[PDB]
């Protein structure tokens, strides 16, 4: 009569898509979008799963991060899809081990224009745009 | 428990030269090293973050490099505004720790000091104390010995020296030696002299007065 | 500009407490963390701790937990640091620092520093004695004069010449601690001898801890 819980699970998409008219930027075979509507870090999974088809919350590897930051603005921050699973450090929906500054947080990760690594924030309820990806 | 050790505490170089300050961590800090500059007035501004990223606004004459435990900050084409202390700081783990700091001094040609002497003021003698001042104006380098002599007696245990920071226009130093005695000890002696020893003077320069 | 304004110098009795303030300005307060570091002696820096400007969460160095307390006023955009049980080892300059956005391992803006002196001595205004020229000074057309600012506590003392009209050749030396238990410095100016009596050299001494302002004319 009050609250309902929805255990949602998220994975990387198996299909191929790229909106050539509305993408934020593109690198290799992946088209990256910045959500125009700000969201929380947890909501970014659903927000990216529904911006465009075959799109999900992406975590930037050291080689993609400079491009993401170059497509960013001075005062703009961006939630990134790097999450913790205990040991084995931080990872993404694409797998791999990420270098994450985890001193002042352990849950949500974001990047700015001048961020050199993904940085974990102490509060995940902040409203920042999401970084979504779709392979071409 | 990550300690930062700065290899040097004082660095001297000329204008237009290149200086390198090194820092060493007790353990790997994964490039989480920042370089800060504190000028003599106490203002601190971050020059470089994440080993090599130059903060926007800082001239490109500052550069950084390093990995693991060894890091280095380089200043190319030394300018007069770069007289300051430079600190390394790791941010890999808590607590944040800093280096001991490296003071950067501008090295220049030898300058002989201008020696002046000041007898105590009569307004001060109306209080029971006499302060005799010996001033060394604009000299380089800083090493100088001043010996006080009352009636040709070598004095000890009654002088205090104060040195200025390097001038931001000719990179010289100034020294003030104060000899403090009571009025009675002042009135007991006659000639009061300060002898100055400096590598820029071939002969020791003595400046004196008679009470 | 000035974006991180720190409180003025403070003199506190041994064992007492002090509240240093750090006011913010040109930036969104609740998006950053505020760090506090201690500079003792003349160089060595020590990271005291940090505070989340949003919720007020704090983190401390273990050598400062039982001395420092960090607080934040969100509506006035201020960060406060309370030090308690101060000993003569806590006489140091305390800095507040706003960290780099997106790089919290670095601190991109720093305050001017707040000097905290811990001593049982009482505040005492200085005596200003003129240092007369005399050809004993005069070396090579250059003659020196000055002002001796003697017997004062605590630091600092601001010395100007003609209230900002000179500044060339002016050497204001660091204070020296005498056997009297108080501080003393000398402010000297070198000038051409030929302009002795033709120009007026007034030294202005300001010791705010004692509400002392002395304008002394240097004359033979």
In angstroms, rounded to a whole number, what is the distance separating the alpha carbons of residues A17 and A133?
9
Number of compact structural domains in chain A: 1
User: What experiment produced this structure?
Assistant: X-ray
Task: Indicate the residue of C52, C54, C102 with minimum beta-carbon distance to A119.
Answer: C102
On whether the CB atoms of residues C191 and C167 are closer than 8 A, the answer is no
Domains along chain B?
Answer: 4-106 (2.60.40.10), 114-210 (2.60.40.10)
In angstroms, rounded to a whole number, what is the distance separating the alpha carbons of residues B55 and B58?
6
> Do C72 and C137 reside in the same domain of the chain?
no
Question: Quick one: closest CA in A to B55, which residue?
Answer: A114
| Chain A residues whose beta carbon lies within 8 Å of the beta carbon of residue C102 | 77, 110-115, 119
Rounded to a whole number of angstroms, the CA Rg of chain A reads 14
Closest to C48 measured CA to CA, from C10, C3, C79, C88: C79
List B residues 116-175 in contact with C (Cβ-Cβ < 8 A): 116-121, 123-124, 127, 131, 133, 135, 137, 160, 162-164, 174
In angstroms, rounded to a whole number, what is the distance separating the alpha carbons of residues B117 and B131?
11
Tell how many helices (H) and how many strands (E) occur in chain A: 2, 9
| Chain C residues whose beta carbon lies within 8 Å of the beta carbon of residue A80 | none
Position A68 in a domain: yes
In angstroms, rounded to a whole number, what is the distance separating the alpha carbons of residues B67 and B28?
8
Position A130 in a domain: yes
Beta bridge partners of C53: none
Phi, psi of B70 (to 5 degrees): -110, 125
Within 10 angstroms of residue A104's Cβ, the number of other Cβ atoms is 18
In angstroms, rounded to a whole number, what is the distance separating the alpha carbons of residues C95 and C168?
31
Beta bridge partners of A121: A108
Within 10 angstroms of residue A5's Cβ, the number of other Cβ atoms is 5
Q: What is the largest CA-CA distance in chain A?
A: 50
> Do C103 and C160 reside in the same domain of the chain?
no
- On the question of a cis peptide bond just before residue B95, with omega within 30 degrees of 0, the verdict is yes
Query: What is the DSSP secondary-structure string of B2-67?
Result: --EEES-SEEEE-TT--EEEEEEESS--TT-EEEEEE-TTS-EEEEEETTTEEPTTS-TTEEEEEE
Question: Quick one: closest CA in C to A115, which residue?
Answer: C102
> Do C102 and C141 reside in the same domain of the chain?
no
Cα separation values, A49 from A29, A35, A93, Å: 19, 11, 12
In angstroms, rounded to a whole number, what is the distance separating the alpha carbons of residues B110 and A73?
52
Position A15 in a domain: no
Chain B contact present for C43, CB below 8 A:
yes
Give the structural domain span for C88.
5-118
> Do C24 and C97 reside in the same domain of the chain?
yes
> Do C112 and C184 reside in the same domain of the chain?
no
Element (H, E) at A43: helix A43-49
Residues 6+ apart with CB under 8 A from C55: A122, A123
| Chain A residues whose beta carbon lies within 8 Å of the beta carbon of residue B50 | 116
| Chain C residues whose beta carbon lies within 8 Å of the beta carbon of residue B94 | 59, 61
Position A19 in a domain: no
Task: Indicate the residue of C134, C139, C175 with minimum beta-carbon distance to B115.
Answer: C139
Within 10 angstroms of residue B25's Cβ, the number of other Cβ atoms is 23
Chain B contact present for C178, CB below 8 A:
yes
Question: Quick one: closest CA in B to A117, which residue?
Answer: B50
| Chain C residues whose beta carbon lies within 8 Å of the beta carbon of residue A122 | 52, 54-55, 57
> Do C205 and C155 reside in the same domain of the chain?
yes
List B residues 189-208 in contact with C (Cβ-Cβ < 8 A): 207
> Do C29 and C114 reside in the same domain of the chain?
yes
Closest to B55 measured CA to CA, from C35, A60, C101, C86: C101
- Rounding to the nearest 10 degrees, give the CA dihedral for residues A42, A44, A45, A48: 170
Resolution (A): 2.6
In angstroms, rounded to a whole number, what is the distance separating the alpha carbons of residues C56 and B46?
25
Number of compact structural domains in chain C: 2
Q: What is the DSSP letter of B140?
A: B
Give the structural domain span for A37.
25-135
> Do C160 and C85 reside in the same domain of the chain?
no
Chain B contact present for A101, CB below 8 A:
yes
> Do C104 and C177 reside in the same domain of the chain?
no
What does the block give as tokens for A93? Answer: 């929906």
Within 10 angstroms of residue A99's Cβ, the number of other Cβ atoms is 16
Question: Quick one: closest CA in A to C108, which residue?
Answer: A114
Position A131 in a domain: yes
The CATH number covering residue C160 comes to: 2.60.40.10
Sign of the torsion formed by the C-alpha atoms of B71, B75, B81 and B83: positive
Position A18 in a domain: no
Phi, psi of B3 (to 5 degrees): -100, 145
In angstroms, rounded to a whole number, what is the distance separating the alpha carbons of residues C110 and B193?
47
The CATH number covering residue A129 comes to: 3.10.100.10
In angstroms, rounded to a whole number, what is the distance separating the alpha carbons of residues C186 and B13?
29
| Chain B residues whose beta carbon lies within 8 Å of the beta carbon of residue A116 | 31, 49-50, 53
> Do C114 and C135 reside in the same domain of the chain?
no
Position A50 in a domain: yes
> Do C16 and C104 reside in the same domain of the chain?
yes
| Chain C residues whose beta carbon lies within 8 Å of the beta carbon of residue B123 | 129-130
Q: Smallest CA–CA separation between B79 and chain C, in Å?
A: 20
> Do C173 and C201 reside in the same domain of the chain?
yes
Task: Indicate the residue of C57, C102, C105 with minimum beta-carbon distance to A122.
Answer: C57
Burial class (CB in 10 A: 0-12, 13-18, 19+), A14: exposed
What does the block give as tokens for C46? Answer: 């020590």
Element (H, E) at B125: helix B122-125
Residues 6+ apart with CB under 8 A from B156: none
């Amino acid at each position: 009569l009050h609250t309902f819980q929805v255990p949602q699970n998220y994975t990387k998409a198996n299909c191929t898509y790229c909106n050539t008219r509305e993408y934020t930027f593109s690198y290799k075979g992946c088209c990256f979008y910045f959500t125009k509507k700000k969201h929380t870090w947890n909501g970014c999974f659903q927000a990216c799963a529904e911006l465009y088809p075959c799109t999900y919350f992406y975590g930037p590897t050291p080689d993609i991060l400079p491009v993401v930051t170059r497509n960013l603005n001075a005062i703009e921050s961006l939630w990134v899809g790097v999450y913790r699973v205990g040991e084995g450090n931080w990872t993404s929906l694409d797998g791999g081990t990420f270098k994450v500054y985890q001193i002042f947080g352990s849950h949500c990760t974001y990047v700015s224009k001048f961020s050199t690594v993904p940085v974990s924030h102490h509060e995940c309820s902040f409203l920042k745009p999401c970084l979504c990806v779709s392979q071409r | 428990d990550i300690q930062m050790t700065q290899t040097t505490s004082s660095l001297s170089a000329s204008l237009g030269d290149r200086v390198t300050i090194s820092c060493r961590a007790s353990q790997d800090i994964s490039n989480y090293l920042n370089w800060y500059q504190q000028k003599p007035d106490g203002t601190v501004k971050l020059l470089i973050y994440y080993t090599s990223r130059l903060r926007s606004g800082v001239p490109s004459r500052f550069s950084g490099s390093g990995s693991g435990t060894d890091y280095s900050l380089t200043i190319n084409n030394l300018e007069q505004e770069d007289i300051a202390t430079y600190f390394c700081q790791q941010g890999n783990t808590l607590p944040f720790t800093f280096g001991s700091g490296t003071k950067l001094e501008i090295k220049r040609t030898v300058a002989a000091p201008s020696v002046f002497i000041f007898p105590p003021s009569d307004e001060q003698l109306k209080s029971g104390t006499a302060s005799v001042v010996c001033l060394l104006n604009n000299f380089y380098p800083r090493e100088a010995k001043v010996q006080w002599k009352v009636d040709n007696a070598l004095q000890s245990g009654n002088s205090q020296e104060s040195v200025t920071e390097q001038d931001s226009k000719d990179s010289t130093y100034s020294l003030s030696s104060t000899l403090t005695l009571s009025k009675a000890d002042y009135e007991k002696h006659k000639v009061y002299a300060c002898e100055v020893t400096h590598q820029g003077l071939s002969s020791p320069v003595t400046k004196s007065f008679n009470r | 500009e000035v974006q991180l304004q720190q409180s003025g110098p403070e003199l506190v009795k041994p064992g007492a407490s002090v509240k240093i303030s750090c006011k913010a300005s040109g930036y969104t307060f609740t998006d950053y963390n505020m760090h506090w570091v201690k500079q003792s002696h003349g160089k060595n820096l020590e990271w005291i701790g940090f505070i989340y400007l949003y919720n007020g969460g704090t983190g401390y160095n273990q050598n400062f937990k039982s001395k420092a307390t960090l607080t934040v006023d969100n509506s006035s955009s201020t960060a406060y640091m309370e030090l308690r049980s101060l000993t003569s080892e806590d006489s140091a300059v305390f800095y507040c620092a706003r960290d780099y956005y997106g790089n919290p391992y670095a601190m991109d803006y720093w305050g001017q520093g707040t000097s905290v002196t811990v001593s049982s001595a009482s505040t005492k205004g200085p005596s200003v004695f003129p240092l007369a020229p005399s050809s004993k000074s005069t070396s090579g057309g250059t003659a020196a004069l000055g002002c001796l600012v003697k017997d004062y506590f605590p630091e600092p003392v601001t010395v100007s010449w003609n209230s900002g009209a000179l500044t060339s050749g002016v050497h204001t030396f660091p204070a020296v601690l005498q056997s009297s238990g108080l501080y003393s410095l000398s402010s000297v100016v070198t000038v051409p001898s030929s302009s002795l009596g033709t120009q007026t050299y007034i030294c202005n001494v300001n010791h705010k801890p004692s509400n002392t302002k002395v304008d002394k004319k240097v004359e033979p």
